[PDB]
Amino acid sequence: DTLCIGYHANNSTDTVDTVLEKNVTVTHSVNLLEDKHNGKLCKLRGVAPLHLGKCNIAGWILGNPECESARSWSYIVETSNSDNGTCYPGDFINYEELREQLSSVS
Amino acid sequence: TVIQEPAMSVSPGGTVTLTCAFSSGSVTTSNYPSWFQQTPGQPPRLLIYKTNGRPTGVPSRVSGAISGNKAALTITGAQAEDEADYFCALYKSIANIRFGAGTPLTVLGQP
Amino acid sequence: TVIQEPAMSVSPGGTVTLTCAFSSGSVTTSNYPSWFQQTPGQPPRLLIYKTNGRPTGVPSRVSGAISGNKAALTITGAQAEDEADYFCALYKSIANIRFGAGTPLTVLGQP
Amino acid sequence: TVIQEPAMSVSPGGTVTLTCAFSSGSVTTSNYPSWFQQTPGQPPRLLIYKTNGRPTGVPSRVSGAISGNKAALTITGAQAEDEADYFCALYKSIANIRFGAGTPLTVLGQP
Amino acid sequence: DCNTTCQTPEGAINTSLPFQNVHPITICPKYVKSTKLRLATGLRNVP
Amino acid sequence: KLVESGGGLVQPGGSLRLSCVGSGFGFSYTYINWVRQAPGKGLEWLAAISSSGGDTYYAVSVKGRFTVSRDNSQNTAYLQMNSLRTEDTARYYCATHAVRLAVASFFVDPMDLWGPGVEV
Amino acid sequence: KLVESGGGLVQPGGSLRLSCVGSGFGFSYTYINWVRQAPGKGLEWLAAISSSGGDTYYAVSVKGRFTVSRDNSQNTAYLQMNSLRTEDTARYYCATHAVRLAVASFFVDPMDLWGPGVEV
Amino acid sequence: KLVESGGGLVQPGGSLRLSCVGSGFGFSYTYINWVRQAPGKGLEWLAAISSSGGDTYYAVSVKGRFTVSRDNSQNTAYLQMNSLRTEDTARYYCATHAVRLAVASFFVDPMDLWGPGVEV
Amino acid sequence: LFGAIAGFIEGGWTGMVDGWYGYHHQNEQGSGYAADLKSTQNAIDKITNKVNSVIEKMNTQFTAVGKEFNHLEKRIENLNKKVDDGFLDIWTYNAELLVLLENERTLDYHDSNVKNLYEKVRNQLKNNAKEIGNGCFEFYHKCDNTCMESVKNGTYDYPKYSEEAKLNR
Amino acid sequence: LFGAIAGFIEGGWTGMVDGWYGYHHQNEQGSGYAADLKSTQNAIDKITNKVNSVIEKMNTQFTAVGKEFNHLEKRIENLNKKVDDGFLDIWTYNAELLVLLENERTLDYHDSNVKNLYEKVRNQLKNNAKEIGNGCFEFYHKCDNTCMESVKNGTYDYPKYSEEAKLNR
Amino acid sequence: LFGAIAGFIEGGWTGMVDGWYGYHHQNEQGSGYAADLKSTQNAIDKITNKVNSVIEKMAVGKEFNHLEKRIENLNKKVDDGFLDIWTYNAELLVLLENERTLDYHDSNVKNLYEKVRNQLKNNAKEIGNGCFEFYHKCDNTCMESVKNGTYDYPKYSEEAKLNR
């Protein structure tokens, strides 16, 4: 008649790193790091975002002819090809200040 | 294998005990008995896990224990919505879960 | 209870020893003897704690130890400002601290 | 003291074993044999440490082990660049490292 | 139409975990240059 | 919730694949159980797959004919049946222990979340 | 330092409350002892209270008649005498082990810091 | 690398100091061994010094006559010989275990990095 | 490191799939595995608390992380980049160190649990059982499933079997 | 976790008010409590050093936190707010994690102290005493207060009582 | 703390220079020291990894004129905060890591002791200072076997029985 104390093992290949030893296989593990996304811009707090397709903020706020196409927005989305802004050459004074101010508007 | 009662009946407002046992052996807490309920046309609903666990959304009337060499499910205050086929799941060893035949509870008290 | 000497005297420049004992039992380091000095009309001043502890501000002349079954306080080279009532505090068991009767030390050398 | 073979010779392509032992005692893995190769007029080069260690830059042909009460160095398939003096270093106790006499290895095959 | 919290220029993040490494710009789990942060919750697997 | 797919008619000796998809309960840290219920008979536990897919456990009556696989990226569990017989006509369920984050998933975890099931 | 208050005349059977206030030695991590000295006699330990007021220790001669309380926010220690007899004529002292930050306050802590005392 | 210095002619009964300087292998975490080889005779271990200089180990035949020191800031190890005899004519080597960062340096560490050596 | 996992006990059991720690019993009524319930439940609760603490201590601030500066504010842009890089490096270092230390201590905790279970069984059996050495206990007295359930539960009756065990010793 | 506080010793002693660890002795001369002075003093010193290490490692210099900006410096104001919020979050995380880890370390240290005291007493008494199980040792030989003081100090004389214990064992 | 170093073993061996932990044996063929190779090597590897991890886990200075004191103070605040955080992190890391290392070494010594104990069983008597005296005369082969981990208990059981 025999009684033996023992522990659990399984066919798990989860590896964790320890300060003394590297690549230690453990029975169970959790991941504290997120590396996935849906690859699509969608609504924060239900509020849809402002999408300036071919315009930057300067063109939209000045009324560029190619920006005629809007009450609340969670965030503003620009694009790498948003080149339609101040059509007539000149300096937009305190432009960065205006963008920082218009970032958060209800 | 798992042996259950062929069928049992109860009167409204009463208490009913359902027993689960082995063909050869003694049911203990190490066998992790589980009690399921299945109304016809619906997926089974777990009532008791590990002889004392009550999932959230299950009334305190349903209780479990280990009576002798069997696992016992006690339902106190039988109602009209407690007529179903109760199933018992027992874990033997080396990853073997076996379900019981199923005891259909008939609550008397209808025209 | 705590038993001390009724009274004793020393000559200036000499050494004096004072004993603290029990009515029934032995005084050990687990009894945590504490030696206090009181001049009349003043709050008592702790000289020794735990038979070997000297608070910062107490001269190195004062020393404590355990002799046989008693706690011993030794003053080597007494001055004239060492005339006071010396008290002994002993811890018995289950949070009981008992003080001694007190020994009035008379340093000789007065007209 | 450390005892080695007075001299040994080998033919090219063959295997050769060199033994290192004590004058009175047994060589074990706790004595840390170390094998050194010295060509004339050059500092010695370490081949094997702790009876199996191969430093980076040493061919896998040279290997070491413990045979009986001796430490053995085996060179498999000797070339003409494996003609040198081989030394054995053994640690006795209380920080005493002793070198062997040295065995000159003469690979045959010269006109 | 994906009403969700913690948008990034790449895409939305739907997690309760404290760390992420998709993008440092967020509108949110904290950003690290960790490639793997797995916390051991079980025994050392010995067969 | 759990949603099952697949299922239908099959010849006595063909093959069929069933899938079970979950949402909202950390699929990557749960055991998945496949159970069946024949019309006129009680539930019959069929198979189980571990969190990482390394441990697959089968019943005595279906050992060698059924295979269980898991795709944690898509949050899917697959049960493939080959050499199907006439006695294997039943409703098939996928069950699991729905927890937001499981630190220890064992084979004896209770079967809380049940899918509607498919027909075979 | 320690400063006491209360005390004065009392009838043989009345009640009296003494308060002891400290500053600069972490009152919340020290035992507080209440001692008394009769004129013409020696010191007589009366009571002790823990750092959190959960442990109260009394002498056999004053057990039941006296009560000890503590208020760490105000840095005050209170001794209340009820059934005041005649033998209870004495000068009362509050004592403690004054340290900056005590990591372990025990009942056997030495009595270093003594208050000037009150009369009863 | 390991570069030695000193060495030359000496009368029987004189003294001489040899130095060994290293670069690129964490000189402060390695044992330093001094060995000799007589012309036409085998190698003979002479002395060893620890990383901090606390431990110095000599051979029986050179005990008392040789002294070993270390300067970790300059990355130098010194061997000073007094009462030099006629039999002490040999080529002298400094050896060590060259590693980037030694967590533990022991007396039985292998002699990997050897200096060209000097003559006496 | 307590010396139980990868030590007195040389390996795990793939047949015990109901818990972390447990027992294997060999009687004349049959052989079997059975995980210890109290130890496994306590370990699960403690590890869940640890994971929840790690998750719910790193949670605060809406934040925007994204400012724009023109060609005449390069110093301010460099200051912003420095702030971002510093916060990033600090948080990466903290995350790595936290994971690395918590792994060592989880593993030590499991080792301690195994060792404590073995020592608990040792103290209860006393001299009624002999230690084989592989990590197990052979009984000097024949005792059935009730005895094994008692020793697993923690209510073994030493004087009940002491007389029978003394003869076989 | 060394398994003594809430282990083979099931609870603390409220009657022991003069120290952390210690002994309770019952002989013909009378029962009593007595804390072990060496271990208690060592523990107090080490814990005091721990608290001081936590406290006197958080020294900073004179700093003014609040800065004020006009309505044309919203970006610099937001940068300042980001700096303060990041430092706040980092320091809150550090403080909470430090306390959480050091509390475990302190509790495990106290467990280790109790366990080491028990093992020290066991290894001096050897077979002159029987281990009951609750952290208690019943002597096979009658021995007085000198005996108990010797075993508390660490100077127990095994050969002095070996012959007497052999008869009663 | 496992109570082995400065615990049951009251002191180290200066005559042992080939390893951290090991054995000292006295027999009829002579006494000697010998480090335990497996445990010492494992400890060295673990400590090397520990030290490498700390190292492997781990452009400034701007100028402002007299009218940018606020941005200068902000830069100073950033630098001081990062400095303080990193000093605190380094100090705490070293302080905790040193204790973990010392406790690891204590555990190693303790485990070596209990491994030898479990091998020997009742064939040897614990002196108490940290050593074992053999009830049976056994030579250098016996000592090498007990050091390796392949001691043959039934070989010497009968001989040790009548000496006990």
TrEMBL record, chain A:
Protein's cellular compartments: Host apical cell membrane
Similarity comment: Belongs to the influenza viruses hemagglutinin family.
Role, per record: Binds to sialic acid-containing receptors on the cell surface, bringing about the attachment of the virus particle to the cell. This attachment induces virion internalization of about two third of the virus particles through clathrin-dependent endocytosis and about one third through a clathrin- and caveolin-independent pathway. Plays a major role in the determination of host range restriction and virulence. Class I viral fusion protein.
Assembly behavior: Homotrimer of disulfide-linked HA1-HA2.
Name of the protein described by the UniProt record: Hemagglutinin
Organism encoding this protein: Influenza A virus
TrEMBL record, chains I, J:
Signal peptide coordinates: none
Compartments, record wording: Host apical cell membrane
Record-stated family: Belongs to the influenza viruses hemagglutinin family.
Assembly mode: Homotrimer of disulfide-linked HA1-HA2. Interacts with human CACNA1C.
Described purpose of this protein according to its UniProt entry: Binds to sialic acid-containing receptors on the cell surface, bringing about the attachment of the virus particle to the cell. This attachment induces virion internalization of about two third of the virus particles through clathrin-dependent endocytosis and about one third through a clathrin- and caveolin-independent pathway. Plays a major role in the determination of host range restriction and virulence. Class I viral fusion protein.
This protein's name: Hemagglutinin
Originating organism: Influenza A virus
Taxon lineage: Viruses, Riboviria, Orthornavirae, Negarnaviricota, Polyploviricotina
Gene: HA
From-to range in the entire protein, with total length: 333 to 501 of 544
